[PDB]
Design a protein around this ligand. Structure first.
Ligand SMILES: CCN(CC)CCNS(=O)(=O)Cc1ccc(C)cc1
Ligand SMILES: CCN(CC)CCNS(=O)(=O)Cc1ccc(C)cc1
Ligand SMILES: *[C@@H]1O[C@H](CO)[C@@H](O)[C@H](O)[C@H]1NC(C)=O
Ligand SMILES: *[C@@H]1O[C@H](CO)[C@@H](O)[C@H](O)[C@H]1NC(C)=O
Ligand SMILES: *[C@@H]1O[C@H](CO)[C@@H](O)[C@H](O)[C@H]1NC(C)=O
Lengths: 535, 533
């Protein structure tokens, strides 16, 4: 050093870092990218719990994003920004345990509340380096210290032979946990406040956040949580020990492989071979189901999330949860016959019934009948536009809306301060067709403030709307309350309660308070369907 | 001797009476025997045609009411007593009544035949609410009503036995229908234009005449008010009728021939005393002795018959009142009473569901609770109370009606549907019960035309409107008034559009979907659930 920028030199537990001064529309921000927090989980370390990164010598260059965790890459619509925006934007490697810090420039002199982002992607994909997760805007406009980590996905992160020493399960969640510990120890060096840490995440990221709430060793590592369109409870976010074991051994067979021997053989397989067979282990033809996800191990998760949220005391927990208007639409083009992004996807009654079997793969013929009958419009039972929309609702309700409603209800009944929202604005920049509405994932670019980038062609009102959302999120992180104190003009966001069930609509219009989060329909999914399946 | 009041029928001569209606005189011929008295060894037996008589038979007064249970829940209370027998009880009760214009119609006049309800355990054609004088005076109708045996006397069955075949109360109805065919022209009636109408069990009877071949030659059109042959209460299987008949016999100290012989020695009231004790569950909207699927009068279950039926040349008017279930709640469901607002707890709602849906398994009862609960206010006692009423109304009447209408329309029938939503200003039941089961009848029969009953002028005009709909339907198969252009028109019910109309003080409003979502639950989902327990 000596001729470098003295404002970008920082020491952490493992050694010295040099970050980079980024340009944001409002001014500069500090970025420290590709900071290693674990020893590379490769070779004999594949499927193993991560170990803390061993100290390095000299100045680690922290000016670029590091490798993305080895993962399936989406092929359905090549070159289409709608899918490609979620695809890896750095080299795929098993050496991928790195994290990223964004702060104001110069760095804050007083301890600043920290936001930690956990990406989604069904636990089979994702990366902290995607453009939609750019932390520079929150850092610049709101003064946030923002952290995001890579964690192992797919087999690498979640293949488990429960009870074994060599593949104990949930190691991708342990990657996340190790990053949270890194923040506690080191974030003060960047001006961050380890006594004020808020997790947020979307989809599998949301489910991860929920699991950290439900896992005791994680509870000492953060203070507040935001769950966007995902939950630990529900049909996709976990598997039993038996089911993880069965999937792990099937995959082993499919790539040509006593747990020790089975795992030793798997560890000799090229990463890509595992990826190429990952989807073949699902027990049924299905959408919104992922082969390798957290396992109920009786360790990280001491019981099912269902049982844990039913018996947990969440007195000192503040939580923000919500959904987008059309959670299920995105998933339909990946498996339900009759659906495509390139046409209006009007479907027949027969295609609806078939689509229900795929969207609710665990349903008996009778439960499937219950779903079809509940979602049918009996005034227009053959109308193809309603059927298409009902198929979307089936998938979004089963997988996201009702699990969320269930989570908010249990958390609120048991001490938590809960705030709930529905996100209803469709980006003017959206490349998916109109019938898909506001699809899964499409609130993220607003929370992170992408509309502030002039090159992205968002409207003026969308720019203002993004600033509103950044305020809610950052005020929640700061105070546990999305409302602003210096502002009694704007309508207030009341907490979700069991008695009144209030949530707010997020759109271009000022906040509107609504009541009941699909109450009738979620009673069907959350109270009735389980009884029917268990008989 | 007024010759307008003297009629010769096949059995002999009758003398009727000239009554006063507010607008003019009418000719009434009351208590005409259409069958040999079903007494002694004829108890439980099919009716036989009345034998001829000498001289002039006095037909100026109502005959005895068929032996039946008499309600005692609210002694002296107008709301219940209005359904109670208003003449002496007797097993000698097979008589009919005819009202016509005075003087007797100059040309063959369309006939309306009323079949009273009362759950097949009660009822009488002599009730004030079934007074045919208004329809005859104002619309010029020829109106006919008959007594038919009810309870054990009409429906106790040992299926396959010669001495208690079942369905004899239905056979009483049919014999009266034959009597109309053979005799009504002497009163100025047109035997080639006969419309049946009936409410509750009467509506269900009408439906059974539709589904029974020998009846089909005796009428041309049908009106079913708040009742259907299909559904959970109107019929029993042969096994279950046999079970009930033998249990009742056992209860009164009684091989089929021997068993029925002993039952025939028992005084009528002894049978009535134990009538209710044979129901398999504590329940409401369930009756002990009802039509039986015998493979004779009913060749299969009504549901099977409506599904396969060809109903091309049939015209049918069907409908329900706004609060079908409320009347039944006070007869067994804890928490309910006419003398308070009947606000109930959640536990009372679950308990009430088991009583109102007595055949439901735990899971099926659970499904009913979750469907009807308002999950925004799961413990609001006002909603729970109104939900309880809706469960009973939907299960027993509304959804069976919607099912019947849909099957009939799909299979060629001309169908008109209504919901009756007007609560009479004179109603003596409390407000929470809304428009209860049975409370459209007094309007259809034109009772608000009686100045001494104190209906509002609006209600008087409303009554005349309904009398027009009903008699226009009888005349033409279409309730719309030809002298009236756009009113708007009452459209036929179809499976596609599902149109029905609201009957109230406001002009007709056309609606689509008769509890469509909820009836899918009852009509499509629940049976599958139970057929898997
Ligand atoms: C939009 C949000 N996510 C990331 C958070 C993007 C994509 N992943 S997804 O799980 O949402 C849908 C999906 C499912 C199955 C396959 C094969 C492909 C895509
Ligand atoms: C309201 C109309 N009906 C006649 C058409 C009057 C009563 N009969 S009912 O079946 O409607 C209700 C009922 C049921 C069971 C008991 C013991 C008492 C009353
Ligand atoms: C939409 O596209 C899919 C896939 O090409 C196809 O199966 C479906 O038939 C299409 N719908 C229509 C009506 O064009
Ligand atoms: C928006 O700006 C212009 C169109 O006016 C175009 O050149 C550019 O590609 C657009 N930006 C994006 C990313 O859509
Ligand atoms: C209404 O009356 C019945 C019987 O008289 C009683 O059981 C019920 O508790 C009453 N409802 C009230 C006042 O809550």
């Amino acid at each position: 050093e000596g001729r470098e920028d003295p404002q970008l030199l920082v020491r952490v537990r493992g050694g010295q870092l040099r970050g980079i001064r980024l340009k944001a529309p409002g001014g500069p921000v500090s970025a420290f990218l590709g900071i290693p927090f674990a020893e590379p989980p490769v070779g004999s370390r594949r499927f193993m719990p991560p170990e803390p990164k061993r100290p390095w010598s000299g100045v680690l260059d922290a000016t670029t994003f590091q490798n993305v965790c080895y993962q399936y890459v989406d092929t359905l619509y090549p070159g289409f920004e709608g899918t490609e925006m979620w695809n890896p934007n750095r080299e795929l490697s098993e050496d991928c345990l790195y994290l990223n810090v964004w702060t104001p420039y110069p760095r804050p002199a007083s301890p600043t509340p920290v936001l930690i982002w956990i990406y989604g992607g069904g636990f089979y994909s994702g990366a902290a380096s995607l453009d939609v997760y750019d932390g520079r805007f929150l850092a610049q406009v709101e003064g946030a210290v923002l952290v995001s980590m890579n964690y192992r996905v797919g087999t690498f992160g979640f293949l488990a032979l429960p009870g074994s020493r060599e593949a104990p399960g949930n190691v991708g969640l342990l990657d996340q946990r190790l990053a949270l510990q890194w923040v506690q120890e080191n974030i003060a060096a960047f001006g961050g406040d380890p006594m004020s840490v808020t997790l947020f995440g979307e989809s599998a990221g949301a489910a991860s956040v929920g699991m950290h709430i439900l896992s005791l060793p994680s509870r000492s590592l953060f203070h507040r949580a935001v769950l966007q369109s995902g939950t630990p409870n529900g049909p996709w976010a976990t598997v039993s020990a038996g089911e993880a074991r069965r999937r792990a051994t099937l995959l082993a067979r499919l790539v040509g492989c006593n747990d020790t021997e089975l795992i030793a053989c798997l560890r000799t397989r090229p990463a890509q071979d595992l990826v190429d067979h990952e989807w073949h282990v699902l027990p049924q033809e299905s959408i919104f189901r992922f082969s390798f996800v957290p396992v109920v191990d009786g360790d990280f998760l001491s019981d099912t999330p269902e049982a844990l949220i039913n018996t947990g005391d969440f007195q000192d927990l503040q939580v923000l949860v919500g959904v987008v208007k059309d959670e299920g639409s995105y998933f339909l083009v990946y498996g339900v016959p009759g659906f495509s992004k390139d046409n209006e996807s009007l479907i027949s009654r027969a295609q609806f019934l078939a689509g229900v079997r795929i969207g609710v793969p665990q349903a008996s013929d009778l439960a499937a009948e219950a779903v079809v009958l509940h979602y049918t419009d009996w005034l227009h039972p053959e109308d193809p536009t309603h059927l298409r929309d009902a198929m979307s609702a089936v998938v979004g309700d089963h997988n996201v809306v009702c699990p969320v409603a269930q989570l908010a209800g249990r958390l609120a009944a048991q001490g938590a301060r809960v705030y709930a929202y529905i996100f209803e604005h469709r980006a003017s920049t959206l490349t998916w067709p109109l019938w898909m509405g506001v699809p899964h994932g499409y609130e993220i670019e607003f929370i992170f403030g992408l509309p502030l980038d002039p090159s992205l062609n968002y409207t003026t009102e969308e720019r203002i709307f993004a600033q509103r959302l950044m305020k809610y999120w950052t005020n929640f992180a700061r105070t546990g309350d999305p409302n602003d104190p210096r502002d009694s003009k704007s309508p207030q966001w009341p907490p979700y309660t069991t008695a009144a069930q209030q949530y707010v609509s997020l759109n271009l219009k000022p906040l509107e308070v609504r009541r009941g989060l699909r109450a009738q329909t979620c009673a069907f999914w959350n109270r009735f369907l389980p009884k029917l399946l268990s008989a």
